[PDB]
Structures are given as C-alpha cells and as structure tokens.
Amino acid sequence: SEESQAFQRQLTALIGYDVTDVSNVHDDELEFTRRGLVTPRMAEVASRDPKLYAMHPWVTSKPLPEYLWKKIANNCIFIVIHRSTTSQTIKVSPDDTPGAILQSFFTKMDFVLRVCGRDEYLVGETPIKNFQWVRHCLKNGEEIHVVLDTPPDPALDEVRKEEWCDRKFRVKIRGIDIPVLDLTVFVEANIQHGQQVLCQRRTSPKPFTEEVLWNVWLEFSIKIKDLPKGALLNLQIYCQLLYYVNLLLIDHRFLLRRGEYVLHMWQISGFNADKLTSATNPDKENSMSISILLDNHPIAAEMPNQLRKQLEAIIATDPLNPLTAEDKELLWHFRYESLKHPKAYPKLFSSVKWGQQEIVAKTYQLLARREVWDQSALDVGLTMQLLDCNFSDENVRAIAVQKLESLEDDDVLHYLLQLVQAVKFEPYHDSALARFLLKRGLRNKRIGHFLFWFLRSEIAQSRHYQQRFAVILEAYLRGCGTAMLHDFTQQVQVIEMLQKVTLDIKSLSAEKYDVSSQVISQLKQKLENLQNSQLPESFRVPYDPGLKAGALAIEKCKVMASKKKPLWLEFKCADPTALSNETIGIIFKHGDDLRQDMLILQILRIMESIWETESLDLCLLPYGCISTGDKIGMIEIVKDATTIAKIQTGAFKDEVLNHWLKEKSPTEEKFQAAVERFVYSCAGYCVATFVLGIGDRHNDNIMITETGNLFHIDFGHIERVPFVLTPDFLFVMGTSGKKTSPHFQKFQDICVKAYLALRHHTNLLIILFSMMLMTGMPDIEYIRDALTVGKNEEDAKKYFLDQIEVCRDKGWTVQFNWFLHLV
Numbered sequence: 001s002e003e004s005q006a007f008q009r010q011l012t013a014l015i016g017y018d019v020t021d022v023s024n025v026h027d028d029e030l031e032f033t034r035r036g037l038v039t040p041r042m043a044e045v046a047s048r049d050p051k052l053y054a055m056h057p058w059v060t061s062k063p064l065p066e067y068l069w070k071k072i073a074n075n076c077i078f079i080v081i082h083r084s085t086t087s088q089t090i091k092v093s094p095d096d097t098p099g100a101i102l103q104s105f106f107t108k109m110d111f112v113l114r115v116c117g118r119d120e121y122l123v124g125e126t127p128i129k130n131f132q133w134v135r136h137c138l139k140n141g142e143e144i145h146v147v148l149d150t151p152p153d154p155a156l157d158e159v160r161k162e163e164w165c166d167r168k169f170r171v172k173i174r175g176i177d178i179p180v181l182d183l184t185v186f187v188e189a190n191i192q193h194g195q196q197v198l199c200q201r202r203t204s205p206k207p208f209t210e211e212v213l214w215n216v217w218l219e220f221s222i223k224i225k226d227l228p229k230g231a232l233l234n235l236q237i238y239c240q241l242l243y244y245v246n247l248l249l250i251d252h253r254f255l256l257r258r259g260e261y262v263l264h265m266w267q268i269s270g271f272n273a274d275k276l277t278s279a280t281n282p283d284k285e286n287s288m289s290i291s292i293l294l295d296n297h298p299i300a301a302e303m304p305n306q307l308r309k310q311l312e313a314i315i316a317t318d319p320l321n322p323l324t325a326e327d328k329e330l331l332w333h334f335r336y337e338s339l340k341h342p343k344a345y346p347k348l349f350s351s352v353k354w355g356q357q358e359i360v361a362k363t364y365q366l367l368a369r370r371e372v373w374d375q376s377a378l379d380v381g382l383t384m385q386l387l388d389c390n391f392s393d394e395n396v397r398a399i400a401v402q403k404l405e406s407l408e409d410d411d412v413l414h415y416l417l418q419l420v421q422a423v424k425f426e427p428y429h430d431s432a433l434a435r436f437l438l439k440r441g442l443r444n445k446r447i448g449h450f451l452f453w454f455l456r457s458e459i460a461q462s463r464h465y466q467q468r469f470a471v472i473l474e475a476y477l478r479g480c481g482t483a484m485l486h487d488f489t490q491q492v493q494v495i496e497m498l499q500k501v502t503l504d505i506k507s508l509s510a511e512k513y514d515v516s517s518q519v520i521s522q523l524k525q526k527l528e529n530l531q532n533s534q535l536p537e538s539f540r541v542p543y544d545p546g547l548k549a550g551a552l553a554i555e556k557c558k559v560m561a562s563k564k565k566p567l568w569l570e571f572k573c574a575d576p577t578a579l580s581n582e583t584i585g586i587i588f589k590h591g592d593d594l595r596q597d598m599l600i601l602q603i604l605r606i607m608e609s610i611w612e613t614e615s616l617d618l619c620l621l622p623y624g625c626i627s628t629g630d631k632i633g634m635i636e637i638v639k640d641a642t643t644i645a646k647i648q649t650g651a652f653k654d655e656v657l658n659h660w661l662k663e664k665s666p667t668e669e670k671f672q673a674a675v676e677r678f679v680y681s682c683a684g685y686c687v688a689t690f691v692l693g694i695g696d697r698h699n700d701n702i703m704i705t706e707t708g709n710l711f712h713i714d715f716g717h718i719e720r721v722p723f724v725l726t727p728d729f730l731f732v733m734g735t736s737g738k739k740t741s742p743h744f745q746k747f748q749d750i751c752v753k754a755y756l757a758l759r760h761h762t763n764l765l766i767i768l769f770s771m772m773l774m775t776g777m778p779d780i781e782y783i784r785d786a787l788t789v790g791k792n793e794e795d796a797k798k799y800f801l802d803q804i805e806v807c808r809d810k811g812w813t814v815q816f817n818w819f820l821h822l823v
C-alpha cells in the first residue's frame with residue numbers, strides 16, 4: 001500500500017526514531033519482534049470493551065483510608081451536576097454507582113457524568129467512593145463538580161487495518177580499530193548470564209595503535225551444549241576499562257550464533273543497565289570496533305532441624321545480602337523445600353549453575369511444580385526482584401510477569417516507570433514483560449498515555465536502548481486508536497515547538513542571572529509568533545492527561561532567574577466547563593537530567609500508597625515531570641508555592657516562615673490548618689528524604705504552598721545533615737532550641753510511624769532503589785543502613801529520633817555553608 005507508508009511515517013514522527021531502519025543492526029531480532037508483537041496487540045485490541053475504553057474510568061478496589069472516612073462520617077456525599085447554565089446538587093451514599101446516582105437524578109425530575117474541566121468520567125459498576133477523582137476531592141477538602149453529557153463515541157477509538165555437541169566453546173578475536181586515540185591494551189571476552197560470569201578468557205596485551213590485530217582463537221572451559229539461552233558474549237577492552245560490547249550467543253530462534261561480526265562498541269563515562277545492552281554503537285565513523293569469528297544447529301525424604309534453621313535464616317535475609325557458596329549449595333540441595341517458600345525464589349534461582357544443561361533442565365522441572373508460587377498472594381517487591389539484572393532466564397522471568405497479571409490498573413500506574421525500565425534487563429527484544437506492557441497500555445488509556453512518554457523519554461535520549469523501546473512504542477501506537485494518535489501528535493508538536501524556544505532563550509545569557517526584560521521581550525515575540533500559525537489550539541498536559549491546555553497567557557510567561565534559564569509558562573485551560581480561571585503552569589527546562597527526577601517522584605508516589613495501606617497521609621506533593629529528550633523537559637507548577645529561600649548574606653531568621661504563613665492565612669482557622677499540614681508534609685518529606693539519601697538540601701530546593709504544604713524540588717545529583725529540619729521549621733512547630741511543643745511531639749510521633757510503615761516494605765524499597773540506580777544514574781548499602789535492616793522497631797525509632805536531633809544541633813550551620821562555599 002501507498003497510504004500504509006504515510007502511516008509508518010506518521011509513527012516515526014511520533015516516536016522520534018525509525019523502526020524500519022537496518023543500518024545499525026546485525027540480525028533481525030527487531031523485525032522478528034515488530035512482527036511477533038502483532039498477535040498480542042490485536043488480541044487486546046479485539047478484547048477491550050469499547051465504551052469503558054473510551055471513558056477510562058480511573059478506579060481502585062482498595063478500601064478508603066480511615067483518614068478520608070473522618071472527612072465524611074455521616075454516610076453521605078455531595079455531588080453537583082451541571083446542565084449548561086443550571087446546576088443541581090445531590091446527596092449520595094459512598095457505595096452508590098454512577099448508574100444508580102443518575103437514576104435518582106432523572107427519577108427526580110443515555111447520558112454520563114464527567115468531571116468539570118477535565119477529561120475524566122464517573123462510569124462503570126464501581127461505588128463512587130472507589131473513583132480517584134472522588135478520593136482526590138475528599139483529601140483536598142474540595143467538592144465534586146461534574147457535568148451531564150453524551151458519551152464519547154467509541155468510533156473515535158478506531159484502529160487502522162494492519163498488514164504484514166561436546167566441543168568447547170570458542171571465539172576468534174581478529175582485532176580492533178578506531179580512527180583516533182597510548183598504554184598497552186587487551187580484549188577480555190566474558191561469557192555472561194545475569195551479571196554472573198560463567199567463563200572468561202583474555203588476549204595477550206599489545207601496544208595501543210589505531211589498528212590492533214591478534215588473530216587468536218580464545219578457548220573457554222564450557223561446552224556448546226551447556227551455553228544457556230540469554231548468554232551474552234561480552235567483549236571488553238582494557239589498558240583500566242575503555243570500551244565494551246555484547247552479543248547474544250543463542251538467538252531469538254534458539255540458533256547458535258555463527259559467523260563474522262564487526263561490532264561497534266560503546267565507551268565508558270569518567271554496574272548499570274547500559275553495560276548489558278545487545279545494541280551496537282550507531283556512530284559508525286568515530287567508534288571503536290572489534291572483529292570476531294564464531295564457527296560452532298540443534299539446541300532446545302526429611303530435613304534435619306538445624307539445617308532448616310540455617311536455611312530459613314538465609315531466606316529471611318535481605319536482597320542485598322550476598323550468598324556464600326555453602327548457601328547456594330544449601331538452597332540447591334533442598335531446592336524442593338525451598339520452593340515451598342516464595343520469598344526464597346530469587347535466592348534459589350541465583351543459586352543455579354546456569355552454566356550446566358542438566359541443572360538448567362532440572363530447574364525447569366522444578367518450575368513445573370510451581371503451585372505454591374501460583375497460589376501465593378502477589379508480592380510485588382519479590383516479583384520485581386526476578387526482573388532485575390541478576391536474572392536472565394526466560395522461564396524465571398516469565399513466572400514473575402505472571403504474578404503481575406493480577407495487578408489492577410491503579411497499581412500498574414504505581415509501578416509503570418520501573419516496569420518500563422526493567423525492559424533494559426531483558427536479554428531479547430520480545431519479552432513477556434514487554435507484552436505485558438503492551439497489553440496493559442492497550443487495555444487502559446491512562447496506562448497507554450504514560451506508557452507513551454516513558455518509552456519516548458528513553459527513545460529520544462538513550463542510544464543503548466532506543467531501538468528496543470521503539471519497537472514497543474510502535475506496537476503500542478499501532479493499537480492505541482486514532483483519537484489517542486491524534487492527541488499524541490498534538491502533544492509531540494507542542495513539546496517540539498517549546499524546546500526550540502527553551503534552548504534559544506538559554507544562549508542569550510550564559511550566567512548573568514539578572515534577567516534583563518530585554519531578554520524577556522523576545523520570549524513574548526516567539527510565543528505570539530508560535531501562537532498565530534503553528535501552536536495547536538489545544539493539547540493534553542503530558543504529566544496530567546485529564547487536563548487539556550489551550551493558549552499561552554503570554555503576559556504571565558517569563559524566564560526564571562536561574563543558573564539555567566528555564567521557562568515559566570502559563571496556559572489557559574481549553575475546557576469551557578472548567579470551574580475556574582487559574583492558568584495551567586509549566587516549567588520547560590534545559591539542563592537537568594529529568595529522568596532521575598521522574599524516578600524519585602515515582603518512588604515518592606509508591607510511598608504514599610504504602611502509607612495509605614496503614615491509614616497515614618503525609619501530604620507529599622509529587623509534582624508532574626517528564627523527560628522529553630536529552631537533558632530537557634517539563635515540570636508541573638504548583639499554585640501558590642514559594643521557596644523557603646525567598647521567604648528569607650547567608651543570614652537566616654527563625655520567625656519569618658510563621659509570619660509568612662500567618663500573612664497568607666485569612667482566618668485563624670486556616671492558619672492552624674496550614675500549621676497542621678506543614679507538620680505532616682514536613683514529617684513525610686523528612687522520612688522519604690532520609691531513606692533515599694537526598695535530605696542534605698539547600699533552601700532553594702524546598703518550597704511551601706500558601707496553604708502550609710511543604711515539598712522538595714529538583715533531585716539533581718544525589719559537614720552534613722540527614723534531612724532539612726531547620727530552626728524556621730521548628731519555630732512553626734512552636735518550639736526553639738532545647739524545649740518541646742505538642743506540634744513537635746506530634747511531628748516526632750508522625751515521623752516514627754512513617755518510617756517503620758516503610759520498613760514493613762523493606763524489600764520493595766530496596767529493589768526499586770537498586771533498579772533506579774542501575775537505570776537512572778550514569779552504594780546501595782546506604783539505604784539498607786538507612787532502613788536499619790533486621791532491627792526491632794525500638795532500635796529503629798531510637799535511630800530516627802537521634803537523626804531528628806542531629807539537625808537540631810546543626811541548625812543553620814549547613815544552610816549557611818552553601819553560601820560560604822559559593823565564595
């Protein structure tokens with residue numbers, strides 16, 4: 001088809017990468033995958049309920065926390081329906097349906113209830129208490145506003161028609177070269193399974209010249225028949241490590257990899273997921289390469305008491321605790337006793353000799369008897385553990401994915417970023433994991449939307465994985481539907497337009513922080529310019545797809561007075577039934593790796609949900625934030641928010657935050673409401689902060705809302721202090737120096753509960769952390785020590801309370817020091 005090519009060109013624009021391109025490839029794993037993924041797309045496409053697919057209700061099954069019950073303790077809920085001019089209020093039970101609500105409305109005196117100002121719908125057989133919008137309003141003291149109108153046509157979701165032996169192992173190393181570069185140098189070759197080195201050989205070292213030829217067969221200890229699926233041949237270059245590259249020994253059709261390869265290699269920055277990729281370096285003209293030859297096809301009682309004790313001990317340990325040789329032989333010998341314990345599984349499967357066919361066969365036999373796994377309650381931290389870089393067996397990874405099926409869409413969103421990054425640890429482009437993302441994204445539009453940007457964030461920035469992630473995007477976009485394709489297109493254009501301006505603004509003053517409004521005159525011109533004949537009438541807010549944004553409030557846009565020169569932008573909201581005028585605020589910023597900011601924010605969200613599970617609410621404020629490309633993207637602007645900094649030559653007054661709060665609080669009520677929140681918000685930011693290692697912060701980077709909510713910003717690259725709890729904060733808590741106050745006693749009390757609530761999920765956190773570093777940064781011990789592993793709840797409460805007081809001793813000391821250390 002001719003028009004099927006316009007489609008493929010529309011898909012390339014949206015992706016920012018071309019998936020038909022075979023210039024940087026050496027087999028067909030990508031194309032085979034493009035093709036393999038059709039089945040699962042089509043099936044979930046052919047499977048999803050058109051109506052609910054259009055209206056994408058954002059629903060949960062989790063109970064309501066006691067803290068939103070106390071916000072409505074009379075079995076009643078007020079919803080307000082809107083005609084066009086007129087409205088009418090309604091009184092409702094938290095267990096009503098939107099089905100049932102309407103009825104009482106019509107029967108008071110076909111159509112559907114939609115949130116005011118937002119694309120967001122109250123529909124489906126769910127009790128109104130279980131809608132997130134609703135729960136957002138209750139937490140926010142806000143009243144629900146809704147608008148009775150037509151269902152969105154499910155034709156708007158239409159999907160285009162698609163069309164489509166015992167010989168030891170060896171490798172010859174012919175040589176290396178690079179146009180430009182002198183120590184000595186050798187090639188180390190590694191047979192790798194899940195970070196585990198199975199066998200290793202080196203070359204002789206020879207002098208580093210632009211072309212280096214060895215002509216040497218490298219014989220390893222392993223038999224061909226014993227190489228396992230997912231084995232990487234890992235080629236490295238030392239002198240010590242300068243370059244690396246990887247190749248799959250067994251391919252996506254289970255064929256032993258044969259032949260001549262010339263492989264363009266990656267270089268080291270001056271251990272993380274980039275070191276694992278089977279992608280070759282695209283920059284063919286400047287990169288180091290290496291020439292290789294492969295010519296190696298069929299592939300395919302009781303327990304004593306003290307031992308069980310030792311055994312269970314090992315299972316009790318944390319992820320990061322390494323296993324002895326004895327521990328592994330122990331796990332593997334009573335592997336059937338081990339299988340009974342699903343927490344054991346990671347330890348057990350990293351206690352397998354992946355280097356032996358008979359064992360591996362045994363391990364498959366053992367995964368057949370899986371019934372205890374399959375019946376266990378879904379433990380996500382356990383499940384994630386089996387998808388990190390320590391696992392590279394398809395069958396082990398697949399039982400982890402299986403566990404994920406039972407997640408509802410609401411949980412998926414909590415884990416989506418980190419599940420998207422765990423695609424970096426799969427050995428083959430077509431994983432169970434990828435198909436799970438595909439499927440879930442297609443099943444639900446909210447998932448699909450974030451799925452898009454998560455993939456595009458990396459596709460647009462990582463040469464190590466763009467090709468893989470692109471194949472997967474294409475596969476999503478090819479099932480998401482015309483209305484969302486349209487949308488994604490509006491959104492991409494806008495983003496593209498707005499980076500041009502961000503970058504161009506920057507190079508008009510390198511660091512003369514005084515933003516002369518001569519610099520601000522041009523911003524205005526480029527925006528109006530963009531307006532009249534370029535910039536789409538309206539577009540979805542990427543970090544909050546409920547909102548559709550309209551036209552730039554050009555007067556309210558500025559450039560911020562930073563080291564970089566990020567854009568402060570305010571838009572009009574495109575929805576007419578919006579119940580307010582407040583502009584939608586966005587910061588576009590070149591200069592920070594916002595991928596890392598996404599990751600920290602996302603954990604932050606996980607922690608709330610944790611805390612939710614024990615009826616705590618720390619009023620974290622994890623703002624929207626998306627990496628769009630290389631060191632560039634968007635950040636959500638919180639309304640009525642200011643820097644602790646600005647509330648103050650390194651001089652720091654104590655009272656001024658409380659004064660600031662009282663001068664923004666009209667009633668005395670609202671001021672106490674504000675001090676309450678500040679304690680909660682603060683307590684939460686301090687705990688989370690501590691756990692992750694990002695509490696030593698300058699005042700620039702901590703803000704507070706007019707309404708008392710404190711929040712940290714900008715997770716750039718992170719004497720000392722465990723968190724920021726300065727005198728200004730203490731002042732507000734009505735205490736100073738050595739004495740105490742009820743507000744401080746409360747804050748201490750709240751920190752404690754917050755901390756060990758988190759410690760009830762020590763493994764989950766430890767994983768997400770370790771994954772974050774491997775896939776988000778360019779060591780982990782910190783966190784385990786900060787979570788105080790293996791301690792009774794008292795030891796811990798004591799620890800964290802000592803921490804509180806470290807900041808008390810210090811006080812301004814550190815804050816001061818940033819200034820001092822400027823000069």
Ligand SMILES: COc1c(OCCCN2CCOCC2)ccc2c1N=C(NC(=O)c1cnc(N)nc1)N1CCN=C21
Nearest residue numbers: 558568592597623635636637638641642643713714715
């Ligand atoms: C300090 O700049 C911010 C705000 O400042 C208000 C000051 C702007 N005025 C007000 C009206 O006229 C223009 C001048 C108000 C709100 C925010 C914010 N920064 C930020 N964040 C950052 O600046 C930031 C920068 N880099 C990175 N990586 N992350 C966040 N956020 C996050 C969401 N809320 C805000």
